[model samples]
Target: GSQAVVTQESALTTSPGETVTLTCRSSTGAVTTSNYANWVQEKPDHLFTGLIGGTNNRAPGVPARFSGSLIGDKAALTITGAQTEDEAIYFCALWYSNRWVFGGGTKLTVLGGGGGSGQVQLQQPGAELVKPGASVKLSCKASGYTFTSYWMHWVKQRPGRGLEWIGRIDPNSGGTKYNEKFKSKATLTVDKPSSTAYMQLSSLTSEDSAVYYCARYRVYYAMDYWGQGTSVTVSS
Candidate 1:
């Protein structure tokens, strides 16, 4: 079976106090309650926040203006009074049996504010090729935001497979928790002064080759800002 493909608008524009809606469509079929559509928002400088989940359930501490719902065959996220702070990338994820599939994300620009938040950025090397038994370290360095104040997550996207949560780390505290499956495979760490997070993947194999992403996680563990992804190709 092929992994589900999630699609979102590449960019959108709205004025302050205006309402805007973003939609997520699943390529396999119509989105349903079983999918548990989740929505997250990213701000400049690696700041990410959770918004909605389970179709329409807002996460605790999420504002009332943000909502999710099933409209026709797609999952929708609506911001009732779009504020300047709403400008950022919004990502939607849908659950499959054992993994989650994510869309490319929608970049929303709120038009009323002057000198809008600086460009959002996360840096990582484009790709790496390694031998089967070797290990590789990936880096995600962020600028323009408070790095130590938030939790960072690493996600895996295998070719034609969905996204898998590898682990999360608290940069400031130097604490970490990994998916049971990745506990023996991935090691997470941070360089405080550089405002960078790193994930070292060991025991490389074809099964471990994938596009890895580093995301900013907010309270409730919602992943928001994401790195462009580092592709690891395991070979001889």
Candidate 2:
């Protein structure tokens, strides 16, 4: 059977002081009440920012600038002041049955002020083919914005919401990494190509799906960059 059919919708405008609520519906049924819904904001070129997590708890160290809440099946993310940096696409996510599911995304627009500027500053990370015994790594560099502001992570996309976590790499010194419960099945690595960061994985397998992404790490462990997403196919 299909994992779950997660559907999302959006609205462009909301009054300055009014709360904007976006809804996510699952064809499988309502998500478990116990699981907390997570929300994120993706500004033009920068990594995605953590807007809300655990229903209402802001990610660790997240500014009081943002807040979240729940109303029945709807999860809400409210930004105070609605600064220009706040204009971006917002997504709602949650962990269910050992996987993460994200809504399609809501594009927000600020009526007044400069709001936030949009820029495509990161290089498109490229994916390559690697043989069963051979190892390969993909690379993407940061531009326009500060490179070290967030953490870089890798993900795999398989058909629908078949996304799986591979691991994460640090941008500063290029240290620190984490393998998901299944990441060890393959190898992941990173390098600094001039100014951009690189990601590598070894011992390839067909299950590797191969869509890797780099992102900024939020205080609540959320990712922001999303490296345009690259795909790698393993063959004999």
Estimate the lDDT of model 2.
Answer: 0.59
Quality of model 1 by C-alpha lDDT: 0.80
Highest lDDT model number:
1
Residues 1-236, candidate 1, lDDT per residue (tens digit)?
35568999989999977779999999989998888888977666544556887788776567777888999999999988887878899889886654567788899998866332224367888898999889999999987678888888888877554457788899889888786678889999999889899999987898888888897765433454678788899884
Model 2 ranges off by over 4 Å: 15-17, 114-135, 138-153, 156-211, 214-236
- The digit string of per-residue lDDT tens for model 2 on 84-160 reads 55557777776555455667777777666543223434565455776676666677766656566556665565543
**TM-score list, all predictions:** 0.59, 0.56
Residue pairs clashing, model 1: none
Report the Cα lDDT for residue 212, model 1.
89
Name the regions of candidate 1 deviating beyond 4 angstroms: 114-153, 156-200, 204-236
lDDT of 1 at 119: 42
